[PDB]
Write an enzyme that holds these catalytic residues in place. Structure first.
Site, PDB file in Angstrom:
ATOM      1  N   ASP A  50       9.753   2.034  -9.945  1.00  0.00           N
ATOM      2  CA  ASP A  50       9.858   0.803  -9.233  1.00  0.00           C
ATOM      3  C   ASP A  50       8.547   1.256  -8.164  1.00  0.00           C
ATOM      4  O   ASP A  50       8.735   2.167  -7.526  1.00  0.00           O
ATOM      5  CB  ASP A  50      11.283   0.544  -8.208  1.00  0.00           C
ATOM      6  N   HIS A 199      10.912   6.426  -8.424  1.00  0.00           N
ATOM      7  CA  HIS A 199       9.884   6.189  -7.334  1.00  0.00           C
ATOM      8  C   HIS A 199       8.853   7.125  -7.428  1.00  0.00           C
ATOM      9  O   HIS A 199       9.082   8.261  -7.988  1.00  0.00           O
ATOM     10  CB  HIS A 199      10.683   5.794  -6.019  1.00  0.00           C
TER      11      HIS A 199
END
EC number: 3.5.1.-
Length: 235
Positions: A50, A199
């Protein structure tokens, strides 16, 4: 269809066994072709990321994925695309998949059909301006918040909603725990068909990923992409 907000959550994997979100959630997602696991019948892991903003480590993450010849799927927001054009270009040129994380990363359950269409198309529009290409339509609801209404509408727009089966706190900039913290989670939570949600903003995340892939491969795991997941599930 109901529009009751739902936050994607699930009991973490234990004993390297695939986790389960329950019958209610399993039925809902399947009714709309959404998924959070790949093929649990083989030791395979699908890496997804993400990306809402850049903190200086994505280039290293891309280098690590290239070194291991692993294909990642990066769900990007409008801001990330506009702020990091060169990185988007790298993802595309290096064979990765660019997924949609919506332009303004809003709570989709609060947006109308027209707004949702714009929130998603705008990301592809900008990505295309940069890459001149367009991946299969994949979506990850902002903050993991969705509803039957959101799933129904996004599916109508041709989007495949992709959740996850592995995730940990590697997004808190005010408390970056280091390589060991991330590495230990990727190894401990590993399971057949796992879809990892990572992430790339926390200190040493690239190094942790490098070690995790190396050790997971040695264990007998193979890393495939979301596109591979979709393809193999068809045949």
């Amino acid at each position: 269809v109901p529009n009751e907000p739902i936050n994607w959550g699930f009991k973490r994997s234990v004993n390297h066994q695939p986790p389960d979100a329950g019958k209610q959630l399993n039925s809902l997602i399947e009714k709309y072709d959404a998924f959070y696991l790949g093929n649990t019948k083989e030791k395979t892991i699908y890496l997804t990321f993400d990306n809402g903003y850049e903190n200086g480590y994505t280039p290293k993450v891309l280098d690590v994925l290239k070194k291991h010849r692993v294909t990642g799927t990066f769900f990007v927001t409008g801001h990330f695309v506009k702020d990091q054009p060169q990185l988007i270009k790298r993802m595309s040129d290096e064979g990765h998949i660019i997924g949609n994380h919506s332009f303004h990363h809003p709570d989709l359950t609060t947006k109308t059909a027209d707004q949702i269409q714009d929130e998603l198309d705008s990301v592809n529009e900008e990505v295309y301006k940069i890459t001149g290409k367009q991946d299969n339509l994949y979506l990850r609801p902002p903050r993991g918040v969705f509803s039957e209404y959101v799933l129904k509408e996004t599916k109508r727009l041709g989007y495949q909603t992709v959740f996850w089966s592995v995730a940990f706190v590697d997004w808190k900039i005010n408390n970056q725990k280091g390589k060991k913290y991330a590495y230990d989670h990727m190894i401990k939570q590993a399971h057949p068909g796992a879809i990892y949600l990572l992430h790339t903003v926390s200190r040493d995340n690239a190094e942790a990923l490098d070690d995790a892939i190396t050790d997971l491969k040695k264990q007998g795991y193979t890393f495939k992409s979301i596109d591979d997941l979709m393809f193999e599930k068809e045949m």
